Design a binder for this molecule. Structure first.
Ligand code: BCB
Ligand code: BCB
Ligand code: BCB
Ligand SMILES: C/C=C1/c2cc3[nH]c4c(c3C)C(=O)[C@H](C(=O)OC)c4c3nc(cc4[nH]c(cc(n2)[C@@H]1C)c(C(C)=O)c4C)[C@@H](C)[C@@H]3CCC(=O)OC/C=C(\C)CCC[C@H](C)CCC[C@@H](C)CCCC(C)C
Ligand SMILES: C/C=C1/c2cc3[nH]c4c(c3C)C(=O)[C@H](C(=O)OC)c4c3nc(cc4[nH]c(cc(n2)[C@@H]1C)c(C(C)=O)c4C)[C@@H](C)[C@@H]3CCC(=O)OC/C=C(\C)CCC[C@H](C)CCC[C@H](C)CCCC(C)C
Ligand SMILES: CC(C)=CCC/C(C)=C/CC/C(C)=C/CC/C(C)=C/CC/C(C)=C/CC/C(C)=C/CC/C(C)=C/CC1=C(C)C(=O)c2ccccc2C1=O
Ligand code: HEM
Ligand code: HEM
Ligand code: HEM
Ligand code: HEM
Ligand SMILES: CC(C)=CCC/C(C)=C/C=C/C(C)=C/C=C/C(C)=C/C=C\C=C(C)\C=C\C=C(/C)CC/C=C(\C)CCCC(C)C
Ligand SMILES: CCNc1nc(Cl)nc(N[C@@](C)(C#N)CC)n1
Ligand SMILES: CCCCCCCCCCCC[N+](C)(C)[O-]
Ligand SMILES: CCCCCCCCCCCC[N+](C)(C)[O-]
Ligand SMILES: [Fe+2]
Lengths: 332, 273, 323, 258
């Protein structure tokens, strides 16, 4: 179990602090090649005549698009989400306004979510933006998703061993470790931190001395919180295929300013963004999904940092189609 | 000036190099050629430290830091204030340490005793090289080395560790810590026991070699022996760094992921996956 | 070259020796037996061993503790054997995940951990008694029992006393291989970085120092084995060239020197102090110091550096930033 | 308000830092550094023509004397004044006290430099039960060589100069520690045995190679007064002899190694 040099290294810190990335070229290149499959933008069409709000029968989101654009969007969508399945993955073969199949109405919500991210989570996704491809990677079910309990393999395009199967209790500690970069942290960062906004990530105190009245007995947060926060940060690390010094000077994890990189503020936004998507878009979809889709507690599959990033500090190495398909936002 | 018993030992000879020229003592210190190089370098190193530290802001001892260059200067010479000092101070350090070491050999020779202490001292010098020379060479920049500052060299250890997510699971480190901890226990055991025998308390008779053996046969079922417990400790201490050196070297040049994942080789045997 | 300092060129066999203690000579169970290979780099006789009461006591409590841990560990892989053997390192028996203050946790959330905690404690005690008694039985000083007490106390600090002092059991050390290691980071992160704890520094200083000292002492003795330097007891009561040469080695190198007894004192003290410094460092943590970095910063100690990537403000503090 | 806060900018952990330092320098300087001076003090020196004071600091740097009560009787008190009465065949090579001394005769027999012994007791080191501790296997009859090792009795001893210098006759064993410590050989062409500490022996299957001294120089290896017994001080004389071979067996040995 080893990885032959050279190693690609960068600097994220004042010299002598040993801060920065540490990359094995073959892996980086293997990820580059995978992320290279991002289909190119379909050719630009000329906007002719009538907003499909007039033209078509059941168009709610993309209603201001002229036809030609609209069908370019529909082709792009098909190319990103359901390439194998073709247009009828979502449409009635003989009625295109029909909402008969759930992918139609899920897709409709996913056009709104996608446009939200690009319009409202600028502080994360900036001018790169996401498209459906970012998560779906050419399949209807996106490869990395999270249920309300750790599952395995992380790539759901792989087949579980018995142990891996969520039903096999003996496989729990492993299902959990493999989600926290192989640690034995007995916590699930996902349901603790990412599924919603219940829990506070910061544990470290901000005064030298213990403030009287939050520092004894049931006043105190339990050490277990610190474990959880370590668990979450191990997960973020593995999700972005990087290490703590991508964001922190370990001198003081808790301090900002010179003691943190730009990417930590971007990360701080991403946690918030993920909670929005989970609470307000993805988790509700259990209303609309086949039971075939749902976790053991009837939860829709939802998202974490892996769902977009898939092992890369910027998903798809920063590939963008934001300017190619503005239907998807930033929406004025 | 001289211990009660010293004079009979202060004879010429034993030099590695130089012979009679520096073969003499200043106070208690033997000089010899390497004592002279030692001093030359110490004075250099310490001078650069002060000249460099004066260019910096702080004079507070805990805060002063002389760091290496940016990774960009690679393995080349860096401007004085931006790593230049650090590269020079490192060279003085090695000069100092190795002179110290060779000097011990000459003292050993002159007293007709084995050279085991200068040998034992090679280990720390080695580990200093693994951290400051070998690993930076393998990774291709002096920038990866550690800064010369009482506290700052800790911030380096801290980050270096967390670059690999949890440095604790580093099998080299695990082995390294294990020797640090036994060695410490055994030094307590071996000292306590020698004192326990020579200092029985009240007015009891000093005890015997046969006692030493009995105590550990009684307590833990095995006594290693008087000569051997010194051969063990030299061994336990030495392997703190000799095994550790592997965990340090593997990190980057041979493993770029978190260290917990390395244990994948076990956890992921497909037989029990 | 002195091959004896590497290994024993010709090994002597001869009748088994017993030194009688003020009691318990009847409790030495087992028959001495002799290993050739062991003989090469050590005494060749393994065993016999004193049984004794505090010994039997320590074995019995120790084992109880081990069963509680191992059962709770087997519950984790749902009593699947192979997965047990597979996941063993990752398996653990944790303190309360929830804040019960100082209240006795439920079995399922730390109850079992406190159990094992208590038993291991009793195990440690009965063993201290054995370590102390055998010296007294054999008419020896108790310096070893006193070095050991310091180590037990450290553990009592991290397992009990600090949890009690701040008032939460959730802070204790879980039993398990990876789990006890995970704690180290959790504890450091909650306390603002143990690198900046002045007692962690003293501890390490002595820990390194023990390495420094046992390598210098071990080697010094091998290096005068020729003059029988290894018979340290009689080199104390009647100084010989072994330790005159040992002393002058060190006087000529660093300028001052120990004696063959005093050096063992230096060692004992250095070993002791690793555990003493660590405990003070823990007794102050949470009780009186919350963030060791900031405490350092409050006092002028901490280094600080130029930014290299742009200084990044807390988004959370921004105008209009969410929660 | 804060736990630990004592006063303006003063707090518990910070006072404890100061105590910890103190406790360390106290134990180190005032205890350990004085335990180190139980042997060899006070320092010896040239003599002053007119001097009259119990020099103040020679008092202050010493511990109070301690007495060891020895197991088979007597006692020993340290520190205590233990001057080297024995005459030394060494000559000052230059003026300053820095200067090394030179042997004026045969330092091996003169016993100087690497060839020095300590003034140990002229007493036979004893086992716990009162017997002589280091004794030849001729005497130590319940002892043996472990099956597997070389029995050197009969093997030739070959000296630094490649010349067979005698014939191993016996091993002496440490009955307290069950451990061999010297070999006895019949010196070649002399009517004498010599002991040689097992550390100066390279023990082959077919010969015992000793590199400290030339075959000539065994003739003057220190003699025991008994034949089945050896004193603490004799052990030192025997051991020092070969040890001094290393600097002195030949003229080039003391000179610059390279
Ligand atoms: C978050 C980061 C962490 C970290 C990061 C870390 C790193 C990055 C490395 C270690 C290494 C090591 N760590 Mg870990 N560590 C250790 C213990 C240890 C050491 C046994 C080992 C080797 C130390 C070394 O290189 O000395 C170096 C000693 C030197 C260089 C001695 C030089 C002396 C020179 C010869 C002479 C100097 C002379 C002076 C200038 C003279 C002054 C003059 C005056 C005195 C007169 C413990 C016990 C713990 C615990 C309990 O948590 C721990 C936690 C952690 N370590 C953290 C998890 N550790 C090292 C290793 O071996 O692991 C593989 C290593 O590379
Ligand atoms: C890979 C891990 C590393 C590590 C990890 C480590 C940790 C984590 C800690 C220390 C600590 C300490 N380290 Mg560091 N270290 C130090 C020196 C020091 C001291 C400042 C201090 C206590 C050392 C000690 O007592 O040991 C035992 C030695 C003894 C008893 C003999 C006395 C030696 C003396 C105390 C050293 C003092 C030297 C001066 C500070 C240096 C300047 C000398 C010149 C300029 C005259 C040197 C000189 C080196 C070199 C030459 O390699 C080194 C390498 C490293 N340290 C590695 C990079 N060290 C502790 C500290 O508190 O730092 C703030 C601590 O917490
Ligand atoms: C990221 C986390 C960090 C961390 C966190 C940490 C914590 C939280 C603590 C330490 C502590 C300590 N650390 Mg640090 N650390 C250390 C070194 C050390 C030690 C000197 C000291 C622990 C004392 C000890 O010997 O425990 C090993 C010895 C023990 C456990 C004694 C055992 C006694 C017992 C009688 C034996 C058991 C007997 C039986 C076998 C029991 C079995 C019975 C059954 C029934 C269970 C180094 C050298 C480094 C380096 C090189 O970077 C480092 C970095 C760091 N530490 C990181 C900054 N460190 C401790 C301390 O000193 O803080 C003040 C402490 O509490
Ligand atoms: C595994 C075995 C180990 C081991 C072994 C042995 N250890 C030995 C011996 C043996 C056998 C000796 O024979 C020799 C000695 O004589 O003992 C008294 C020695 C010695 N072990 C010292 C320090 C020590 N051992 C450490 C570790 C271990 N030792 C491990 C544990 C540590 C740790 C862990 O931090 C330290 C700091 C010195 C006191 C002494 C060298 C003096 C010197 O070389 O004088 C000559 C040099 C100087 C007086 C100063 C030179 C200053 C340079 C030019 C400028 C500073 C350089 C810069 C790099 C500093 C940065 C500081 C910054 C990080 C804050
Ligand atoms: C700075 C100084 C230090 C220091 C000092 C000292 N350290 C000492 C002493 C001193 C001086 C002693 O005198 C004492 C001792 O005696 O040594 C010879 C001891 C010790 N330090 C041990 C371990 C150690 N020290 C560590 C650390 C440091 N130490 C630090 C560094 C660490 C670290 C590194 O983490 C470790 C792990 C043990 C070997 C030993 C205690 C055993 C015990 O307390 O017993 C407790 C009793 C038991 C475990 C009983 C159960 C065992 C059985 C086999 C389980 C069987 C299960 C089965 C199911 C049963 C079937 C039954 C059948 C009939 C059906
Ligand atoms: C002055 C001048 C300009 C001179 C030219 C000559 C010259 C080169 C002088 C040297 C100048 C210098 C730079 C001196 C500094 C030397 C140094 C590096 C001293 C370090 C002191 C330290 C920190 C030691 C740490 C370990 C420690 C705490 C030791 C104390 C205990 C002792 C004394 C251990 C040594 C020791 C050991 C290990 C034994 O086993 C032993 C066995 C039997 C008898 C004695 C001993 C004994 O003395
Ligand atoms: C594949 C190329 C493809 C075709 C063809 C296509 C066409 C299409 C049309 C003409 C409409 C408008 C019909 C009407 O009047 O209501 C339309 C609308 C939506 N589509 Fe579509 N579509 C194709 C593929 C896909 C795929 C693969 C999906 C599901 C992932 C999908 C979904 C939808 C949704 C939702 C709408 C509503 C648009 C809105 O703005 O509300 N289509 N499609
Ligand atoms: C982009 C506009 C976009 C479309 C189109 C889209 C469609 C879509 C469908 C058809 C489903 C249902 C699939 C099924 O068979 O159940 C679906 C489900 C999920 N999506 Fe999606 N999706 C679009 C964009 C995005 C983006 C940007 C992400 C990731 C942040 C994302 C994620 C998911 C997840 C999670 C689900 C639910 C789980 C599931 O049903 O498989 N989608 N998407
Ligand atoms: C690498 C495994 C790693 C560690 C360790 C780590 C720790 C850590 C802590 C202790 C906190 C708490 C801060 C406090 O208590 O005030 C914390 C918080 C954040 N981190 Fe982190 N962190 C590690 C890695 C990473 C990585 C790789 C990034 C950047 C992509 C990152 C980011 C953040 C952010 C953002 C926070 C704040 C959370 C919030 O405010 O809600 N960390 N980290
Ligand atoms: C999950 C909470 C999460 C983390 C953590 C995270 C981090 C992160 C960082 C550090 C950056 C910037 C890296 C850099 O500037 O070098 C970044 C950037 C983007 N992210 Fe992200 N991110 C998290 C979650 C998510 C999710 C779920 C998505 C996709 C819907 C997503 C997307 C993006 C995009 C787009 C970017 C790139 C911005 C750019 O400048 O290219 N992230 N993320
Ligand atoms: C108020 C009350 C009621 C009580 C007072 C509190 C009390 C005294 C509690 C004490 C708490 C203490 C002592 C807690 C300390 C915890 C600490 C220090 C734990 C440290 C380390 C734990 C470790 C490494 C645990 C490891 C355990 C094991 C590996 C199990 C051993 C297994 C074997 C022997 C069999 C191997 C099986 C294999 C073949 C598959
Ligand atoms: C003569 C001294 N013997 C001796 N001394 C010591 Cl410190 N330990 C041991 N034995 C072990 C098993 C223990 N405890 C450590 C190897 N024997
Ligand atoms: C608190 C630790 C366990 C206490 C009980 C242990 C049994 C005590 C045995 C003591 C025997 C007495 N002796 C001979 C050592 O003095
Ligand atoms: C980091 C722990 C503190 C280490 C303590 C170091 C003690 C060194 C003692 C040397 C003092 C020598 N002398 C001659 C001045 O006494
Ligand atoms: Fe010793």
């Amino acid at each position: 179990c080893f990885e032959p040099p050279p190693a690609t290294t960068t600097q994220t810190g004042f010299r002598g602090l040993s801060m920065g990335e540490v990359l094995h070229p073959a892996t980086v290149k293997a990820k580059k090649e995978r992320d290279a499959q991002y289909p190119p933008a379909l050719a630009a069409v000329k906007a002719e005549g009538p907003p499909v709000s007039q033209v078509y029968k059941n168009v709610k989101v993309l209603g201001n698009l002229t036809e030609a654009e609209f069908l370019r969007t529909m082709t792009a969508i098909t190319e990103w989400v359901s390439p194998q399945e073709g247009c009828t993955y979502c449409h009635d073969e003989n009625n295109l306004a029909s909402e008969a199949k759930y992918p139609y109405v899920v897709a409709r919500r996913m056009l709104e979510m996608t446009r939200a991210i690009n319009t409202n989570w600028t502080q994360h996704v900036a001018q790169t933006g996401v498209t459906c491809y970012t998560c779906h990677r050419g399949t209807p079910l996106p490869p990395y998703v999270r249920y309300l309990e750790p599952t395995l393999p992380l790539n759901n395009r792989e087949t579980p061993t018995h142990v891996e199967r969520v039903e096999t209790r003996s496989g729990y500690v492993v299902r959990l470790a493999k989600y926290t970069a192989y640690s034995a942290l007995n916590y699930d960062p996902f349901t603790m931190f990412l599924a919603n906004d219940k829990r506070q990530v910061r544990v470290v105190p901000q005064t030298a001395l213990p403030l009287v009245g939050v520092s004894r007995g049931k006043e105190r947060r339990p050490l277990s919180d610190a474990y959880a926060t370590f668990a979450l940060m191990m997960s973020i690390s593995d999700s972005l295929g990087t290490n703590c010094t991508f964001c922190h000077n370990a001198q003081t994890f808790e301090s900002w300013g010179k003691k943190s990189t730009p990417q930590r503020a971007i990360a701080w936004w991403g946690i918030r963004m993920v909670r929005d998507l989970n609470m307000n878009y993805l988790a509700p979809l259990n209303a609309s999904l086949p039971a075939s889709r749902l976790g053991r507690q009837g939860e829709a599959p939802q998202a974490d940092c892996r769902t977009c990033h898939q092992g890369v500090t910027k998903p798809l190495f920063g590939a963008s189609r934001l300017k190619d398909y503005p239907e998807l936002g930033p929406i004025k | 000036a001289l211990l009660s018993f010293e004079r009979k030992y202060r004879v010429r000879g034993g030099t590695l190099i130089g012979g009679d020229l520096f073969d003499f003592w200043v106070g208690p210190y033997f000089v010899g050629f390497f004592g002279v190089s030692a001093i030359f370098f110490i004075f250099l190193g310490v001078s650069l430290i002060g000249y460099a530290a004066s260019q910096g802001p702080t004079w507070d001892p805990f805060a002063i830091s002389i760091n290496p260059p940016d990774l960009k200067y690679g393995l080349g010479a860096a401007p004085l204030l931006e790593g230049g000092f650090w590269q020079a101070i490192t060279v003085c350090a090695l000069g100092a340490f190795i002179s110290w070491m060779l000097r011990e050999v000459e003292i050993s020779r002159k007293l007709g005793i084995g050279w085991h202490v200068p040998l034992a001292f090679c280990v720390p010098i080695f580990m200093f090289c693994v951290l400051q020379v070998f690993r930076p060479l393998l990774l291709g920049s002096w920038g990866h080395a550690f800064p010369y500052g009482i506290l700052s060299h800790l911030d380096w250890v801290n980050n270096f560790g967390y670059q690999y997510l949890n440095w604790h699971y580093n099998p080299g480190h695990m082995s390294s810590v294990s020797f640090l901890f036994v060695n410490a226990m055994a030094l307590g055991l071996h000292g306590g026991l020698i004192l326990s025998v020579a200092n029985p308390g009240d007015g009891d008779k000093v005890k015997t070699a046969e006692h030493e053996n009995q105590y550990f046969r009684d307590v833990v079922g095995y006594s290693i022996g008087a000569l051997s417990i010194h051969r063990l400790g030299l061994f336990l201490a030495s392997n703190i760094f000799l095994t550790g050196a592997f965990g340090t070297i593997a990190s980057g040049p041979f493993w770029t992921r978190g260290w917990p994942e390395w244990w994948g080789w076990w956890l992921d045997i497909p037989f029990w996956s | 070259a002195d091959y004896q300092t590497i290994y024993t060129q010709i090994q002597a066999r001869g009748p088994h020796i017993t030194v009688s203690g003020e009691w318990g000579d009847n409790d030495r169970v087992g028959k001495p037996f002799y290993s050739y290979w062991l003989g090469k780099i050590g005494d060749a006789q393994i065993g016999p061993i004193y049984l004794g009461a505090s010994g039997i006591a320590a074995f019995a409590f120790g084992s109880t503790a081990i069963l509680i841990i191992l059962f709770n560990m087997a519950a984790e892989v749902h009593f699947d054997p192979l997965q047990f053997f597979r996941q063993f390192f990752w398996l653990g028996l944790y303190p309360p995940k929830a804040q019960y203050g100082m209240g006795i946790p439920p079995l399922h959330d730390g109850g079992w951990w406190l159990m094992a905690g208590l038993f291991m404690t009793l195990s440690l005690g009965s063993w201290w008694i054995r370590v102390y008694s055998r010296a007294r039985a054999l008419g020896l000083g108790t310096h070893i029992a006193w070095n050991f007490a310091a180590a037990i106390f450290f553990v009592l600090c991290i397992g009990c006393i600090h949890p009690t002092l701040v008032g939460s059991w959730s802070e204790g050390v879980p039993f398990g291989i990876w789990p006890h290691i995970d704690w180290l980071t959790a504890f450091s992160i909650r306390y603002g970085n143990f690198y900046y704890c002045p007692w962690h520094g003293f501890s390490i200083g002595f820990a390194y120092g023990c390495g420094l000292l046992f390598a210098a002492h071990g080697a010094t003795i091998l290096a005068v084995a020729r003059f029988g330097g290894d018979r340290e007891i009689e080199q104390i009561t009647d100084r010989g060239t072994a330790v005159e040469r040992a002393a002058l080695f060190w006087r000529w190198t660093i300028g001052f020197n120990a004696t063959i007894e005093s050096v063992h004192r230096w060692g004992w003290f250095f070993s002791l102090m690793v555990m003493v410094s660590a405990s003070v460092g823990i007794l102050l943590t949470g009780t009186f110091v919350d963030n060791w970095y900031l405490w350092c910063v409050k006092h002028g100690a901490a280094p600080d550096y130029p930014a290299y990537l742009p200084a990044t403000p807390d988004p959370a503090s921004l105008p209009g930033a969410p929660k | 308000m804060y736990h630990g806060a004592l006063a303006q900018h003063l707090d518990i952990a910070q006072l404890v830092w100061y105590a910890q330092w103190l406790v360390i320098w106290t134990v180190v300087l005032l205890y350990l550094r004085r335990e180190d001076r139980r042997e060899g003090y006070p320092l010896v020196e040239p003599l002053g023509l007119v001097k009259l004071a119990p020099e103040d600091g020679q008092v202050y740097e010493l511990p109070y004397p301690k007495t060891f009560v020895l197991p088979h009787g007597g006692t020993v008190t340290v520190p205590r004044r233990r001057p080297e009465t024995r005459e030394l065949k060494l000559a000052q090579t230059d003026g300053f006290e820095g200067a090394p001394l030179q042997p004026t005769g045969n330092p091996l027999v003169d016993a100087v430099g690497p060839a020095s012994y300590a003034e140990r007791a002229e007493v036979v080191d004893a086992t716990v039960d009162g017997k002589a501790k280091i004794v030849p296997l001729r005497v130590a009859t319940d002892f043996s060589i472990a099956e597997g090792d070389v029995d050197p009795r009969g093997l030739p001893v070959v000296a630094a100069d490649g010349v067979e210098a005698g014939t191993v006759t016996d091993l002496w064993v440490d009955r307290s520690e069950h451990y061999f410590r010297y070999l006895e050989l019949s010196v070649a062409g002399s009517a004498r045995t010599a002991l040689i500490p097992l550390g100066f022996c390279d023990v082959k299957k077919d010969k015992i190679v000793v590199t400290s001294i030339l075959s000539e120089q065994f003739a003057n290896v220190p003699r025991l007064q008994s034949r089945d017994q050896i004193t603490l001080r004799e052990e030192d004389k025997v051991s020092a002899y070969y040890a001094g071979g290393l600097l002195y067996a030949t003229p080039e040995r003391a000179e610059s190694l390279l």
